[PDB]
């Protein structure tokens, strides 16, 4: 072992994703942002963004531009559950289908880089007995 | 509007991208030598095409 | 009568040519030889850490002597082996391209091989001369 200690600290805490804290994360453009996430996400933006992902962000952006007392930005519903969550859309609330219903989700910062449909299960869980 | 939505999903490089020459089928297709025939349609045309059972 | 590479066993000729290339010291050895595994189908790096590169370059040289314009893609298939997919059956997988390409590139600048016309890598005018030499100093015992 030789020697081990156990200290800890926090530079003003703050949530951080791959070395970048929330302050710079949110106003980075998604083209610059995608350069620091996984291989599957990086490939998708190079393959070309069809109109559906870019159109949803604009509606989500506008939906926040509805409330300026800083409360929840009202829900935008969508089928495109192959959407990759970007820092631009943190805090917005979207309704993502599952084949039958509009699951309502709130974009937490820790959700960034994941697929939009991964938090709205498409099947009700099995329950034996 | 509707023409941009009707039959809009891509129908290439798939099983629904191709069909039998004779019975417009999607299942059991034979693509060897560019036959593009359902496996059932091939049996009823094998003698005509020139395929015979020897061994 | 003369001596050729074909008149000496392959396995102990390479062990002699590997020794020569190490004592000669002139072969440029890439910096990752102590880290890498030979093939993606392998699961461990070679056990002869100091000498595996010399012996593999020796193996590449001997194999090229008997043939004509072997490429580097063909070299990956030759030294590749059966991968141990866990529950799936085994399969042949090619060896690493960089390891083979550096040896043939390193050996061309040491003087033993050269790029042959119509693809591949031929053995040099001097490549035949010095390999046949090593065979003679192998069989004196």
């Amino acid at each position: 072992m030789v020697d081990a200690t156990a200290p800890k600290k926090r530079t003003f805490k703050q949530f951080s994703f791959k070395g970048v804290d929330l302050k710079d994360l949110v106003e980075m453009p998604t083209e610059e942002f995608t350069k620091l996430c996984g291989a599957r996400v990086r490939r998708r933006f190079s393959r070309g963004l069809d109109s559906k992902p870019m159109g949803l962000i604009k509606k989500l952006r506008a939906a926040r531009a509805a409330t300026e007392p800083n409360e929840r930005p009202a829900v935008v519903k969508t089928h495109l559950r192959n959407m990759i969550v970007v820092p631009e859309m943190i805090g917005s609330v979207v309704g993502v289908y599952n084949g039958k219903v509009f699951n309502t989700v709130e974009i937490k910062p820790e959700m960034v880089g994941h697929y939009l449909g991964e938090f709205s299960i498409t099947y009700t869980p099995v329950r034996h007995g | 509007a509707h023409e941009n939505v009707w039959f809009s999903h891509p129908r290439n490089f798939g099983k629904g991208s191709r069909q039998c020459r004779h019975c417009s089928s999607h299942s059991g297709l034979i693509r060897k030598y560019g036959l593009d025939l359902c496996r059932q349609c091939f049996r009823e045309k094998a003698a005509d095409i020139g395929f015979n059972k020897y061994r | 009568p003369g001596v050729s590479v074909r008149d000496v066993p392959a396995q102990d000729f390479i062990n002699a040519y590997a020794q020569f290339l190490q004592r000669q010291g002139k072969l440029e050895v890439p910096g990752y030889v102590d880290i890498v595994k030979t093939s993606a189908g392998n699961d461990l790096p070679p056990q002869e850490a100091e000498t595996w590169f010399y012996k593999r370059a020796a193996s590449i040289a001997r194999h090229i002597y008997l043939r004509k314009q072997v490429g580097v893609g063909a070299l990956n298939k030759l030294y590749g082996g059966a991968k141990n997919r866990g529950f799936r059956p085994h399969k042949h997988v090619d060896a690493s391209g960089s390891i083979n390409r550096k040896c043939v590139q390193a050996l061309q600048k040491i003087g033993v091989l050269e790029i042959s016309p119509k693809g591949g890598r031929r053995i040099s005018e001097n490549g035949q001369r010095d390999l046949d030499r090593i065979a003679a100093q192998t069989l004196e015992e």
């Binding site: - | - | 074909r6 008149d7 000496v8 066993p9 392959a10 008997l66």
Partner: protein, 140 residues
Amino acid sequence: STQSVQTFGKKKTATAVAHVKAGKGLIKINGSPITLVQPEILRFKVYEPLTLVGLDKFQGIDIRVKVTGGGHVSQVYAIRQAIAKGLVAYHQKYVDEASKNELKKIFASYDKTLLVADSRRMEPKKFGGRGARARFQKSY
């Protein structure tokens, strides 16, 4: 040209073409001496056609054989046949047939495959099983 006869030996897919010319007794396998046939454990399979008749028979002839097809072991049986068939055919053409009618006697009395190719080939596979005769396991 000089006195040359060319023959071949076979096993499953392996075929070994033997060239037997008049000379000092050169015996090469794909350009390599027979003293280095890899099989090793089986080096005596190709040494058999040599020690049965005596090395004195190979002083005046030189033999260069090539071998393609088959597998590692299947090629060895093809090689030993090509040498044996080559030795008999040279005697029939350039030596008296009384001598040819002697070597064939010793070879056949020891192993028929030295001179006669084995007729066994792989049986085709039939559907309903993973092999020629093997079938899929049945359940009731």
